[PDB]
DNA sequence: CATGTAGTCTAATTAGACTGCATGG
DNA sequence: CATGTAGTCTAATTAGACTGCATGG
């Protein structure tokens, strides 16, 4: 039960950005000071050779982020590789069962996972994904344990529309509900 | 690493076998004298399930496709004392020139073992005994062997069935079983030469045969593809009852479901060498009830 | 008829088996406890010979095609205490619309049994014990049953395997064995109904199946060609190990020579009902040595 | 079989099968003119004859066998005449200690094909002998009669006998086959 | 009025080569 | 240089209706 925390107790976030850098995106929402303190954000592009001992010595984490390449075609690796490696480190970053503080995780997909990779992702992450539309106001799938990313009612769009669209402000609105749990910076 | 348990506190073993095949794991455990309290098998091959149910008279609970096993299933069907499994290697072995690797094709099924293993692991604060084992081929890309070792957080020990059987079978064995790196020793009941596996009035040309696959050409030995057996002066291939003796299975173990020569070799070709698995499961009879 | 032999004066039996098939005659004598001194088998089917040599470990001397056995061979290989044989019935049975009778095709191979029987008969003035037996189908012409009875100079006794097995098999039996017309009695280890012959987790629709031939459609019962077994809620045909138990043969008796379903059913369809032959050979224990 | 003096030769007791040779043996001087009880017996269909029938018909000295000569009126298969001739022959053979001569012969008038031929030689323990009369200006014989297995007739090409058989589509040729039996039995004139 | 120690014919099926190359011996 | 928990084809090979009728029930 991840209840809300009083404002005078909200410690600053310590996140783990995997396969993409969201520091310049998390800064804009004031989750971390521009002054370069070391422990606020850790970013790794290639995970292949990292061990649980690396994740544990990198300080405890409150947020673990996951993201696939955004149609950049700079993909040496299969699309399922980004999901499997993200699941391997989340168990490394998860703390002891007794929860001292809130722990959140998120994995987003930039429409690079086919239907076969999708049901594998929702099964390993233990929840079906929600779809956030950003392309046509006038789009990414998100797996996350954060409540307000499985709570509010976004634009219910069809899969035939998602198929035709395949032929950052919205993913910034799902980073927002983590603000009622940690420090606010301006 | 695990402390020893006295004989009185020993309870029957509870096993979760993913990609069970022809129930080699249950056969080995029951052949060591271990009481099998529960053996949950994840198998989708009808002929393979038929072997396990008939040869073991329904002591195995089949739980179809591993990708449909939920977290609640592991908790309902559990707790498990042993989690074993060998994932298909048709997309990992070098013998296939069109293998898709670990992240495509049927190589993804390795993660299903990794996923359900974490579900089966005892939560922290539960110092109860728990063992696991994963088998696969040695003829895989070093990138595949590396990544497998990363998810299981362990390095494999290679055991070749050449030391305990009459055939070459080089396989990797990830796990945490007691004494997996110990020197492999040959038993008295092990048939080490091909002549020990043949029937009456049949002569073996070699002492050891090359690695047996699902194909009928892995029986043809050498680069010239020579028949391994002579009977009545004429040449001949190995028999199904002889392939079973080579792998260490009981005779007529795959004589079910009206299976022919091709079907029985397919099940045996991708199975485990029984005396190798016995070497791995041998130190488990000091933590569970003996029969 | 033939005088009784004291227990100490008994000697191992010497058998000449024509059209031996899968060595049913030798299997019965060995299961009765009779010490077999010599078993000369005339058979031309390589797969049938393979069964007899492997399952009996070379105690059977194979003497190929019966038409090549000379008078000198009967004297050299003899003397014989028992001469058994079942002639091919593919030209005698009513089930064949194009059967060629007793004097054409394979039906004339009966006279080979008649020919070598007179060769094996003791000469005038030799009061030593001598027995023989000939088996063939019931569904033959009256002209063929008449002539066969004239050459053997005796009338057959019909014994249906329905009394001791789980299948219809009506067969004629010429011979001079002790107590052939005696009432057929069921044994303690006779699997009388189909459910006794099936494997685990298999249900039998019927209690007794129709006559099993070499064709796979004789397994489908009745006029509507019904599958005789239900497994996991699905219909299914009989298995090879189940066909063996129906005929009374040991389990996996035809698991030889990489034979498949159709091959094993071909050898079993021709064969004899083991408990019927046991009923006929039973009174031979009081004329030959035991073990 | 040794030779018998003339003052001891008993008359033949023949058994003719499938073909009556009474007119042939009487002509050569083996049978007796007066139709008294004793001489050959003649049967056509032996399907219902048992060992007791042959034994009570008196001990036999000659057992004759023959197939229909291109009769085209065969209700019986060609091999049927051989197997039945075999079955009755062993009914006619006497006690093992044979007192007197015992002869038998089988004649085929080009009816048994190749497959039936080797069967006849296996059962009669003898390869046949060909006796021709077709172009003296033919029948095959299996017989334990010595001078029929001793004297050699004119060699006949096998490719020729089968060509003259169907292009043609039995008493004067086998008359020479009955000839050497005079030495062992009585001569009537 | 259902049954059978099978043979012919045809469509499935399956048994065998053809392929393929990183890599220790 | 020989080896391999295999995937294609192509070609044997097998597996399955259709047949067939005397005959006691
Ligand atoms: N999706 C799936 N779910 C469960 N089992 C599967 C599966 N896909 C393949 N398998 C089975 O996994 C097995 C791997 S072969 C290993 C067999 C087993 N280790 C033995 O000793 O015999 C195959 O038999 C295959 O039938
Ligand atoms: N010419 C011949 N010589 C010897 N055996 C022959 C033969 N022709 C056929 N056979 C064999 O005779 C057998 C008759 S079927 C009877 C088999 C035997 N009674 C059993 O119990 O199995 C067939 O197996 C066939 O292979
Ligand atoms: Mg280890
Ligand atoms: Mg009788």
Identify the residue whose Cα has the smallest distance to the C1' of E6.
C96
- How far, in Å, are A90, B228, B260 from residue B239 at the CA level? 50, 11, 11
Neighbours of chain A (3+ CB pairs under 8 A): B
Distance C138 CA to F24 C1' (A): 13
Q: Which of C12, C27, C279 is nearest to C129 (CA)?
A: C12
- 3-state secondary structure (DSSP) of residue C86: strand
How many CB atoms within 10 Å of residue D122? 18
Reported residue count of chain A is 186
Cβ neighbors of C2 (< 8 A, separation 6 or more) are C129, C130, C131, C178, C287
Cβ contact C259:C233 at 8 Å: no
Sign of the Cα torsion C185, C187, C188, C189 reads negative
- 3-state secondary structure (DSSP) of residue C159: strand
Q: Identify the residue whose tokens are 């048992």.
A: D50
Distance C152 CA to E11 C1' (A): 46
State the closest ligand 2 atom to the C-alpha of C86, by its place in the atom list counted from 1: 19
Q: Which of B197, B249, B176 is nearest to B26 (CA)?
A: B249
**Catalytic (active-site) positions of B:** 89
B173 Cβ inside 6 Å of ligand 1: no
Cβ contact C116:C74 at 8 Å: yes
Angle at C259 between CA C254 and CA C265, to 5 degrees: 60
How many CB atoms within 10 Å of residue B286? 13
B218 Cβ inside 6 Å of ligand 1: no
Q: What are phi and psi of D45, to 5 degrees?
A: -110, 110
Kindly tell me the burial class for residue D167, based on how many C-beta atoms sit within 10 Å of its own C-beta (0-12, 13-18, 19 or more): exposed
A52 Cα–ligand 2 center, Å: 72
How many CB atoms within 10 Å of residue A73? 5
How many CB atoms within 10 Å of residue B104? 16
Give the separation between CA B109 and CA B89, rounded to whole angstroms: 10
The annotated binding site of B is made up of 20-24, 43, 65-67, 270-272
Cβ contact D5:D180 at 8 Å: no
Cβ contact C234:C265 at 8 Å: no
Sign of the Cα torsion C72, C77, C81, C85 reads negative
Reported residue count of chain C is 291
Q: E strand or H helix at A90, and its extent?
A: helix A79-93
Strand partners, C190: none
Give the separation between CA C201 and CA B155, rounded to whole angstroms: 41
A50 Cα–ligand 3 center, Å: 20
State the closest ligand 1 atom to the C-alpha of B106, by its place in the atom list counted from 1: 8
Question: In whole angstroms, what separates CA C55 from the centre of its chain?
Answer: 16
Please state whether the peptide bond connecting residue C79 to the residue before it is cis, i.e. omega within 30 degrees of 0. yes
Q: Which residues of C201-233 are buried (b: 16+ CB within 10 A; e: fewer)?
A: ebebeeebbebbbeeeebbbbeeeeeebbebee
Strand partners, B131: B82
Q: What are phi and psi of B167, to 5 degrees?
A: -140, 155
Solved by what technique? Answer: X-ray
The alpha-helical segments, DSSP class H, found in C32-189 are: 46-55, 71-77, 109-120, 142-151
Q: Identify the residue whose tokens are 């029969």.
A: B291
Give the separation between CA B252 and CA B234, rounded to whole angstroms: 25
Cβ neighbors of B64 (< 8 A, separation 6 or more) are B42, B43, B44
Cβ contact A139:A169 at 8 Å: no
User: What fold is seen in the domain B194-268?
Assistant: Ubiquitin Ligase Nedd4; Chain: W; (2.20.70)
Give the separation between CA C127 and CA C3, rounded to whole angstroms: 9
Domain ranges of chain C: 13-176+269-286, 194-256
Give the separation between CA B185 and CA B156, rounded to whole angstroms: 19
Protein residue whose Cα sits closest to atom 18 of ligand 1: B21
- How far, in Å, are B102, B261, C175, C185, C209 from residue C272 at the CA level? 55, 26, 15, 17, 16
Structure-token pair, residue B127: 């110092």
Cβ contact C265:C216 at 8 Å: yes
State the closest ligand 1 atom to the C-alpha of B85, by its place in the atom list counted from 1: 19
B111 Cα–ligand 1 center, Å: 14
- How far, in Å, are B223, D143, D145, D175 from residue D105 at the CA level? 65, 4, 8, 13
Give the separation between CA C48 and CA C60, rounded to whole angstroms: 12
Question: In whole angstroms, what separates CA C170 from the centre of its chain?
Answer: 12
How do beta strands B131-137 and B170-175 pair?
Answer: antiparallel
Sign of the Cα torsion A34, A37, A40, A45 reads positive
Q: Which of D152, D147, D146, D106 is nearest to D132 (CA)?
A: D152
Cβ contact C51:C60 at 8 Å: no
Active site annotation includes C154? no
DSSP string covering C243-290: HHHHHTPPTTTT--TT--HHHHHHHHHHS--HHHHHHHHGGGGGTS-B
Ligand 2 neighbours (beta carbon < 6 A): C 19, 21-22, 24, 42-45, 48, 65-67, 86, 88, 109, 270-272
Please state whether the peptide bond connecting residue B207 to the residue before it is cis, i.e. omega within 30 degrees of 0. no
Angle at B282 between CA B279 and CA B286, to 5 degrees: 160
Angle at D186 between CA D185 and CA D187, to 5 degrees: 125
Question: In whole angstroms, what separates CA B221 from the centre of its chain?
Answer: 23
Q: Which class in CATH covers the domain with range C194-256? A: mainly beta
Cβ neighbors of D79 (< 8 A, separation 6 or more) are C103, C104, C108, D112, D116, D119
Q: E strand or H helix at A65, and its extent?
A: strand A63-67
Q: What are phi and psi of B42, to 5 degrees?
A: -105, 105
Strand partners, A140: A132
User: What fold is seen in the domain D1-189?
Assistant: Rossmann fold (3.40.50)
Protein residue whose Cα sits closest to atom 20 of ligand 1: B271
- Touching pair C, B by Cβ (3+ pairs < 8 Å): yes
Resolution in A: 3.0
Cβ contact A110:A70 at 8 Å: yes
How do beta strands C131-137 and C170-175 pair?
Answer: antiparallel
Residue among B16, B18, B19 whose CB has most ligand 1 atoms within 8 A, to mutate: B19
Domain ranges of chain A: 1-186
Strand partners, C171: C137, C159
C252 Cα–ligand 1 center, Å: 26
Strand partners, C233: none
C169 Cα–ligand 2 center, Å: 18
Q: Which of D86, D111, D83, D109 is nearest to D177 (CA)?
A: D109
Give the separation between CA B49 and CA B54, rounded to whole angstroms: 9
Structure-token pair, residue D40: 């050959």
Give the separation between CA C198 and CA C189, rounded to whole angstroms: 15
Distance A109 CA to F4 C1' (A): 38
Q: Which of A104, A110, A114, A65 is nearest to A85 (CA)?
A: A65
CB hemisphere CA count around D16 (13 angstroms): 14
CATH superfamily of the A1-186 domain = Vaccinia Virus protein VP39 (3.40.50.150)
Q: Which residue of A has its CA nearest to B153?
A: A51
Q: E strand or H helix at C41, and its extent?
A: strand C36-42
Cβ contact B168:B161 at 8 Å: yes
Q: What are phi and psi of C30, to 5 degrees?
A: -70, -30
Q: What are phi and psi of D83, to 5 degrees?
A: -60, -40
Q: Which ligand is nearest to the CA of C116?
A: 2
Strand partners, B14: B38
Cβ neighbors of B200 (< 8 A, separation 6 or more) are C53, C54, C57, C58
Give the separation between CA C125 and CA D10, rounded to whole angstroms: 28
How do beta strands B82-86 and B131-137 pair?
Answer: parallel
How many CB atoms within 10 Å of residue C268? 21
Give the separation between CA B280 and CA B82, rounded to whole angstroms: 12
Reported residue count of chain B is 291
Residues in chain B within 8 Å Cβ distance of A81: 103
List the B234-236 sheet strands across, edge first: B203-204, B229-231, B234-236
Give the separation between CA A130 and CA A124, rounded to whole angstroms: 15
Distance B96 CA to E19 C1' (A): 10
- Residue to test with chain C: of B56, B233, B258, most C Cβ within 10 A: B258
Give the separation between CA D114 and CA D146, rounded to whole angstroms: 25
DSSP string covering A143-177: EE--GGGTTS------HHHHHHHH---HHHHSSGG
Structure-token pair, residue C221: 């019962």
Give the separation between CA B270 and CA B212, rounded to whole angstroms: 8
B107 Cβ inside 6 Å of ligand 1: no
- How far, in Å, are D133, D154, D176 from residue D137 at the CA level? 9, 13, 17
- 3-state secondary structure (DSSP) of residue C3: coil
Catalytic choice (C45, C89, C154, C240): C89
- How far, in Å, are A185, B284, D151 from residue D65 at the CA level? 126, 84, 21
> Which residues make up the environment of ion ligand 4, defined by Cβ < 5 Å?
C 180
Cross-chain residue pair A97–B124, CB shorter than 8 Å: yes
Q: Identify the residue whose tokens are 């696939």.
A: A68
How do beta strands C229-231 and C203-204 pair?
Answer: antiparallel
Give the separation between CA C59 and CA C42, rounded to whole angstroms: 14
Residues in chain D within 8 Å Cβ distance of C65: none
Measure in Å the smallest separation between the Cα of C234 and chain B Cα atoms: 12
Give the separation between CA B174 and CA B193, rounded to whole angstroms: 28
Cβ contact B50:C200 at 8 Å: no
Residues in chain B within 8 Å Cβ distance of A77: 103
Give, to the nearest 10 degrees, the angle between helix A79-93 and helix B142-151.
Answer: 30
Give the separation between CA B66 and CA B103, rounded to whole angstroms: 17
Give the separation between CA C160 and CA C183, rounded to whole angstroms: 12
Neighbours of chain D (3+ CB pairs under 8 A): C
Give the separation between CA B167 and CA B249, rounded to whole angstroms: 13
Helices (H) and strands (E) in chain D, counts: 7, 6
Helix/strand/coil (H/E/C) assignment for every residue in chain B: CCCCCCCCCCCCEEEEEECCCCCHHHHHHHHCCECEEEEEEECCCHHHHHHHHHHHCCCCEECCCHHHCCHHHHHHHCCCCEEEEECCCCCCCCCCCCCCCCCCCCCCHHHHHHHHHHHHCCCCCCCCCCEEEEEEECCCCHHHHHHHHHHCCCCCEEEEHHHCCCECCEEEEEECCCCCCCCCCCCCCCCCCHHHHCCCCCEECCCCECCCCCCHHHCCECCCCECCEEECCEEECCCHHHHHHHHCCCCCCCCCCCCCHHHHHHHHHCCCCHHHHHHHHHHHHHCCCEC
Give the separation between CA C122 and CA C187, rounded to whole angstroms: 34
Distance B241 CA to F4 C1' (A): 23
DSSP string covering C180-241: SSSPP---TT---SHHHHS-TT-EES-SSBPPP-SSGGGSSBTTTTB-SEEETTEEEPPPHH
Looking at residue D90, what DSSP letter applies? H
Question: In whole angstroms, what separates CA C207 from the centre of its chain?
Answer: 23
Q: Which residue of D has its CA nearest to C100?
A: D77
Cβ contact D184:D101 at 8 Å: yes
User: What fold is seen in the domain B13-177+272-286?
Assistant: Rossmann fold (3.40.50)
Cβ contact D4:D184 at 8 Å: yes
Q: Is C13-176+269-286 assigned to CATH 3.40.50.150?
A: yes
Q: What are phi and psi of C132, to 5 degrees?
A: -155, 165
Torsion region of D10: left, alpha or beta (phi above 0 gives left; psi -120 to 50 gives alpha): beta
Torsion region of A90: left, alpha or beta (phi above 0 gives left; psi -120 to 50 gives alpha): alpha
B230 Cβ inside 6 Å of ligand 1: no
Measure in Å the smallest separation between the Cα of C156 and chain D Cα atoms: 16
Looking at residue C68, what DSSP letter applies? G
Q: Which of B268, B250, B231, B252 is nearest to B191 (CA)?
A: B250
- How far, in Å, are A134, B167, B173 from residue A26 at the CA level? 18, 59, 44
Angle at B6 between CA B5 and CA B10, to 5 degrees: 75
Strand partners, C17: C41, C84
How do beta strands C229-231 and C234-236 pair?
Answer: antiparallel
């Amino acid at each position: 039960m991840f209840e809300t925390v009083p404002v005078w107790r909200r410690q600053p976030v310590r996140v783990l950005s995997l396969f993409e850098d969201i520091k310049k995106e998390l800064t804009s929402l004031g989750f971390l000071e521009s002054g370069s303190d070391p422990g606020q954000l850790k970013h790794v592009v290639d995970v292949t050779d990292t061990v649980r001992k690396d994740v544990e010595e990198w300080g405890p984490f409150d947020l673990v982020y996951g993201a696939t390449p955004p149609l950049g075609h700079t993909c040496d690796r299969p699309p399922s590789w980004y999901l499997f490696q993200f699941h391997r480190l989340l168990q490394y970053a998860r703390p002891k069962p007794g929860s001292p503080r809130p722990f959140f995780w998120m994995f987003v997909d930039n429409l690079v996972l086919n239907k076969e990779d999708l049901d594998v992702a929702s099964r390993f992450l233990e929840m079906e994904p929600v779809t956030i539309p950003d392309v046509h106001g006038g789009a990414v799938r998100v797996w996350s344990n954060i409540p307000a990313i499985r709570s509010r009612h976004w634009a219910l769009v069809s899969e035939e529309e998602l198929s035709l669209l395949a032929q950052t402000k919205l993913v910034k609105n799902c980073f927002l509900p983590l603000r009622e749990y940690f420090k606010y910076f301006s | 690493l695990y402390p020893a348990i006295p004989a009185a506190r020993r309870r029957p073993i509870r096993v979760l076998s993913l990609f069970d095949g022809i129930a080699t794991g249950y056969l080995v455990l029951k052949e060591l004298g271990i009481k099998v309290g529960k053996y949950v098998a994840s198998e989708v091959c009808e002929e393979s399930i038929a072997v396990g149910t008939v040869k073991h008279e329904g002591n195995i609970k089949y739980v179809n496709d591993v990708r449909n096993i939920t977290k609640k299933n592991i908790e309902e069907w559990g707790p498990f004392d042993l989690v074993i499994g060998g994932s298909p290697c048709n997309d990992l072995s070098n013998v296939n020139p069109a293998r898709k690797g670990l992240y495509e094709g049927t190589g993804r099924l390795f993660f299903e073992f990794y996923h359900l293993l974490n579900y089966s692991r005892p939560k922290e604060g539960d110092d109860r005994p728990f063992f696991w084992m994963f088998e696969n081929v040695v003829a895989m890309k070093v990138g595949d062997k590396r990544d497998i070792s990363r998810f299981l957080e362990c390095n494999p020990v290679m055991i070749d069935a050449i030391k305990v059987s009459a055939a070459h079978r080089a396989r990797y064995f990830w796990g945490n079983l007691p004494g997996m790196n110990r020197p492999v020793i040959a038993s008295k009941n092990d048939k080490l030469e091909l002549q020990d596996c043949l029937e009456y009035n049949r002569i073996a040309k070699l002492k050891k045969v090359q690695t047996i696959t699902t194909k009928s050409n892995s029986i043809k030995q050498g680069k010239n593809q020579l028949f391994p057996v002579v009977m009545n002066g004429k040449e001949d291939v190995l028999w199904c009852t002889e392939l079973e003796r080579i792998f260490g299975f009981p005779v007529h173990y795959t004589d079910v479901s009206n299976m022919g020569r091709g079907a029985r070799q397919k099940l045996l070709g991708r199975s485990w060498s029984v005396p190798v698995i016995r070497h791995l499961f041998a130190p488990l009879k000091d933590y569970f009830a003996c029969e």
